[PDB]
Enzyme design. Structure first.
Site, PDB file in Angstrom:
ATOM      1  CE  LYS A  52      67.465  12.870 -20.376  1.00 13.34           C
ATOM      2  NZ  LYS A  52      68.695  12.137 -20.071  1.00 13.34           N
ATOM      3  CE  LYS A  64      65.241   2.561 -27.368  1.00 12.32           C
ATOM      4  NZ  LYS A  64      66.377   2.044 -26.567  1.00 12.32           N
ATOM      5  CB  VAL A  95      44.661 -16.742 -35.043  1.00 15.51           C
ATOM      6  CG1 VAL A  95      43.618 -17.524 -34.251  1.00 15.51           C
ATOM      7  CG2 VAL A  95      45.118 -17.443 -36.345  1.00 15.51           C
ATOM      8  CB  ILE A  98      45.703 -16.113 -31.507  1.00  8.57           C
ATOM      9  CG1 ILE A  98      45.434 -17.567 -31.867  1.00  8.57           C
ATOM     10  CG2 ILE A  98      47.184 -15.937 -31.202  1.00  8.57           C
ATOM     11  CD1 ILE A  98      46.561 -18.202 -32.678  1.00  8.57           C
ATOM     12  NE  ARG A 141      36.737  -2.853 -43.980  1.00 12.00           N
ATOM     13  CZ  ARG A 141      36.650  -2.091 -42.880  1.00 12.00           C
ATOM     14  NH1 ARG A 141      37.529  -2.170 -41.880  1.00 12.00           N
ATOM     15  NH2 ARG A 141      35.649  -1.216 -42.782  1.00 12.00           N
ATOM     16  NE  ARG A 175      31.033   5.999 -37.671  1.00  9.96           N
ATOM     17  CZ  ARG A 175      32.334   5.855 -37.597  1.00  9.96           C
ATOM     18  NH1 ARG A 175      33.104   6.905 -37.367  1.00  9.96           N
ATOM     19  NH2 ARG A 175      32.877   4.640 -37.745  1.00  9.96           N
ATOM     20  N   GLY A 181      33.981  -3.855 -40.954  1.00 13.42           N
ATOM     21  CA  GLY A 181      34.732  -5.022 -40.482  1.00 13.42           C
ATOM     22  C   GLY A 181      33.829  -6.161 -39.970  1.00 13.42           C
ATOM     23  CG  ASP A 184      28.728  -3.630 -32.523  1.00 16.10           C
ATOM     24  OD1 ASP A 184      27.882  -4.003 -31.701  1.00 16.10           O
ATOM     25  OD2 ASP A 184      30.012  -3.513 -32.265  1.00 16.10           O
ATOM     26  CG  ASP A 248      30.464  -9.035 -31.652  1.00 19.97           C
ATOM     27  OD1 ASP A 248      30.803 -10.115 -32.097  1.00 19.97           O
ATOM     28  OD2 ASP A 248      31.212  -8.310 -30.888  1.00 19.97           O
TER      29      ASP A 248
HETATM   30 BA   LIG Z   1      43.806 -11.643 -32.100  1.00 21.89          BA
HETATM   31 BA   LIG Z   2      32.988  -4.401 -33.164  1.00 16.13          BA
HETATM   32 BA   LIG Z   3      62.500  14.128 -19.325  1.00 15.91          BA
END
Ligand SMILES: [Ba+2]
Ligand SMILES: [Ba+2]
Ligand SMILES: [Ba+2]
EC number: 2.7.7.7
Length: 327
Positions: A52, A64, A95, A98, A141, A175, A181, A184, A248
């Site tokens: 805190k 919490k 998606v 989305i 991947r 790299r 993914g 680029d 891309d």
């Molecule tokens: Ba999305």
């Molecule tokens: Ba990217």
């Molecule tokens: Ba504080």
DNA sequence: CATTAGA
DNA sequence: TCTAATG
């Protein structure tokens, strides 16, 4: 990094939810600076009261933390993990196309599943449509081995159209990364820099090329300086077709490449780190340039770069191969 | 943090 | 125009 883990982890868990399932941008913004500070703190939080003391840390969150500290869990947390609406909101989101806004919208209508989505293909736009189309592959991947394959082809056509083209495949691949993914591609041309009032076509030329040969298979979005797509390596002599892959392509003024190239290659920390350093070295680095610092507080006037080197030389550092730009 | 879509 | 979605 580990002694304040659960908290930050539990915390982020919490913040994401506000943002997504709810529209609590602020609560969300809250959980986050918290999860932020409690993360920096050098000591095991022993209690909420302890925590805190922090900045960002209020009575709500402290509350919490003791509950988490106390018992190995959180109800709010258990509750949300269980909640179907919320579950659905997290789910539709993956998606491509989305967003949370859309996510809630669909749910409201009652479109909670993958199939829901198909059944109502009409309620989806082109983007969302493709997204839906390649749900599997988009999640899958990209083996480096493939990145080699892709990058090959991409370079050929770029060249074929105009030999004056400059394309580099940025990202973790750049790299050495065993897998990526999406791909680029930072692009440039002499004929296109800072002032030279565009040449949209410059982009336009290659997209068409990639298409003509069947590399590009869809368009998520194409603009005059940044294309967004879907690709696919030619499926061999059968029995093994290749998964659709997100690509891309972005045009770039030849007078801003290397920074951007340097930049898009990361790593996030390498980046930041080199940046920290240019500051001492009397400079400023950003996705587009490198300016010299003026004591008054700040200064402008972009130094000339013709290669990843120049930037290096400037802040008098050791040229680092992209390989070892990890941090 | 800037670009695109779209409605 | 705004506002969402990608990166
Ligand atoms: Ba999305
Ligand atoms: Ba990217
Ligand atoms: Ba504080």
């Amino acid at each position: 990094e580990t002694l304040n883990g659960g908290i930050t982890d539990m915390l982020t868990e919490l913040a994401n939810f506000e943002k997504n399932v709810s529209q609590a941008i602020h609560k969300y913004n809250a959980y986050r600076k918290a999860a932020s500070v409690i993360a920096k703190y050098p000591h095991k939080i022993k209690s909420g009261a302890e925590a805190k003391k922090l900045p960002g840390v209020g009575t709500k969150i402290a509350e919490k933390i003791d509950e988490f500290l106390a018992t190995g869990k959180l109800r709010k947390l258990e509750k949300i993990r269980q909640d179907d609406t919320s579950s659905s909101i997290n789910f539709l989101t993956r998606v491509s196309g989305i967003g949370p806004s859309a996510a809630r919208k669909f749910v409201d209508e009652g479109i909670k599943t993958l199939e829901d989505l198909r059944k109502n293909e009409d309620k989806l736009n082109h983007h969302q449509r493709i997204g839906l189309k390649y749900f599997g592959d988009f999640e899958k991947r990209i083996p480096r081995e493939e990145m080699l394959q892709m990058q090959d082809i991409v370079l050929n056509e770029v060249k074929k159209v105009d030999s004056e083209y400059i394309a580099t495949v940025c990202g973790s691949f750049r790299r050495g990364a065993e897998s990526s993914g999406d791909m680029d591609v930072l692009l440039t041309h002499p004929s296109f820099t800072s002032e030279s009032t565009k040449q949209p076509k410059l982009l336009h030329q290659v997209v068409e090329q990639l298409q003509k040969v069947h590399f590009i298979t869809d368009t998520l979005s194409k603009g005059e300086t940044k294309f967004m797509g879907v690709c696919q390596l030619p499926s061999k002599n059968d029995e093994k077709e290749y998964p659709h892959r997100r690509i891309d392509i972005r045009l770039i003024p030849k007078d801003q490449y290397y920074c951007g190239v340097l930049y898009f290659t990361g790593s996030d920390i390498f980046n930041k780190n080199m940046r920290a350093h240019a500051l001492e070295k009397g400079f400023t680095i950003n996705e587009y340039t490198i300016r010299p610092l003026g004591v008054t507080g700040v200064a402008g006037e972009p130094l000339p770069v013709d290669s990843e080197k120049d930037i290096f030389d400037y802040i008098q550092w050791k040229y680092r191969e992209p390989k070892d730009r990890s941090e």
